[PDB]
């Protein structure tokens, strides 16, 4: 909320090479200030050269701008029709000094960024300055530093939820919390790794089902088509979905070795063979840099699949599906229950079409979960718009602003944490507007705007809700969902 | 031309007539023990022990034999000649230092105090040392194998398979996206595999973890060698924002991860990717007890993929580093063990020969513990190894090398005592899996069968149902 009008400041000069040419170079710094660096901008709102001199090789000048026609754009368009100067009538850029001008409220403590020299508050805003060649113009770097300095704005001005539907409350007779009651009669146990589970038969039946219910009550009646989505996922991958705007504190990072020479892994060996320890600082070294992470969102990494390609137009709805293996996110410390885990499993939904085919494929979503958590399920949920999915993944909060972008979360009830308890959430659609499209580049024969959305169904989550809420004993259970199961098997019992 | 073996400790204690008629003591029977004549075990606040010996009732086993009499340590050399048979290479070992190539054998140098051999750290060292040394001194053999057929698809399945738009190349090395014509090959196997062997036989469906830590693999013996080929996994230092604002901002502004800053900022690995699938189960079962009412347990997963660095090279679905495996795993007496080895063998020769109704042999190979840790040849025990499934690709011609695509293994008491699984009566455990490499399946298949339904077997068509169509672009 201030008012302060955004600018840049360019002091540079250019480099066949004469002297005294200046008749054309006045006459063309006109024809450019009140045309060439018109275009784009609104009236009166283009850049402008405002003053320059000379040297035996170099023509030095200031050029200013706001918003619109940047310096760093403008100057190409001037070396251009510089270039048609002193051609046949009578070679690079420099830059003496770069600065943006940026509204902004609060002061803004200096970090690490490339290509910034110094950084300070002024009247209204802040002042940068920048230590950029002509490439980095080419490159756009400024537009980047100005779209990274403005976010950062954003956030020191300153989570979204507000209700959609909910569920008539039920007596809630199961007042104990489920990992804790599977963990004491046989269905799982902790896996050796954090927020790792093992599940026995009894358990893993119970995801078998509920997998089940989205194929034949989900999957199948709505049209979509299996796929196997890959779930080592890379930075490139990342870079498309944009990801790797943030994401990197959550992730566990992939490396893979340098060489299969076992030569090269002797050293190892033999120290384990030795302490009977592991040399992890050693394989710490041994070990490539990260090729990218494992699976944490499960679409990004299907969209390799459509990149750089055309849909025609009688091929979407493309509406497909993965349950392929595991996703892993690094969650807040503290042990948890299968309520928040780090390896879980889930069946990503994607869907891509026209704006108006993604709506109607979510609202078709949302039909059939509320069947199937209402009828099949018969439990105590609700629905929320909510802070985005990529938006969260990727550092940032509120929300989207076209009015139907975003994400929806369903959140359920769980009796043992109490009458105050905070619900969980177990289950989201969301559309993602042209995101995904844009950033893999996936275009569409008609030419028209391709937009896809997501839904994701943590099993881990559904089971916890049903289990919080029906408990373990299937003469409690739904008896809809009792035929689903057929008869539960018989844990691994030890003595 | 060789020699003996030799140990020699200078070493003193901090704690004259009756001290000097210990030499005569020492050397006639208290150490002259645990080893035949002469061999047993020189030079006399600050006592000095200068002591050399043989490979019997060793240094370190004779300092506490004179720890306990000298009632009535800190180390500042300890030598050992090794009868090493040829010039061998420099190795950075933990507790050596000196590592001399002499012309008669190799010497060595350790640095160890009084606490390094109450733990026996020469002990495994020599044992490693002459482990390595026997260097400068896989297994195959067919067992059954079915007559030849003729091969009317000659065409590399992958290849045909791009073409005919069922997949393309992930991002990673050694990965794909399948399609829906390839996925729904996959889910066809998978309800073949249920079906007609998992459900028979009674198997009960478990989810096994699939990020694999250190202690998994140090009880299931990988951690002696599995190195070369394994995805490892790192978390953060931290998930403090503020500690990868740095990261993020240099990506936002550049448009590359800075991955030597991630690498730095990232913990030690805890570990690695799924390699062999069953080992995380183990951890279920560890340190328990199983009633005899129990046995045989018979488990399987299906929850996710593996993850290997195979060799370099641009391969198809028949050599990927990210695979679709169904763990079979189980748990027995040895009979009860080699029945279940039997069962399968048996399931899968209904599903190979009249299901898929492809060309196959089996062949009696290397265990795939052994492989994975560095080791090769054989299992000394006779019942304890695996079997091998290959299948020939028509499309590498009549020389061409068969792929294997299936595996049994019986892997004795391994797992069990390695994990410390004892059955409640107390007789040994013994255990046995098979890994269905589902790519491995959907390369023999394809390249025997072709990617047109319409030659594929009558049972096998039935289980597929009607191809789904894939997605096309211009
Ligand atoms: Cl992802
Ligand atoms: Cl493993
Ligand atoms: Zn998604
Ligand atoms: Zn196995």
Redesign the pocket.
Known sequence: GSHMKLQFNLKAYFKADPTPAKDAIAALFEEANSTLLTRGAPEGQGAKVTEWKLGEDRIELTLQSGRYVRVHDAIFRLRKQLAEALGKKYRGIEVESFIIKVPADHELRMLKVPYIKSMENIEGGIQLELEVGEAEMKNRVPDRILTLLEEKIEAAQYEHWNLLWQREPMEHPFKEDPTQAMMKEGWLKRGSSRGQWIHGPQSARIFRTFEKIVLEELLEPLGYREMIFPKLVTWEVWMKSGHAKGVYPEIYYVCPPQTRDPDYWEEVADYYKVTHEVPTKLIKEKIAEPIGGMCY????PFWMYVAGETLPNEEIPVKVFDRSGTSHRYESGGIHGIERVDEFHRI???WIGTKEEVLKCAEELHDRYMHIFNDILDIEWRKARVTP?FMAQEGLLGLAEENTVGTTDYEACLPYRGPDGEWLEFQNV?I?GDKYPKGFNVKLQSGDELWSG???VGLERWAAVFLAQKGLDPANWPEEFRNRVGEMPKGIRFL
């Open positions: 969102a499960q679409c990004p990503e939904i994607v999915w969301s993602n997501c839904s994701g």
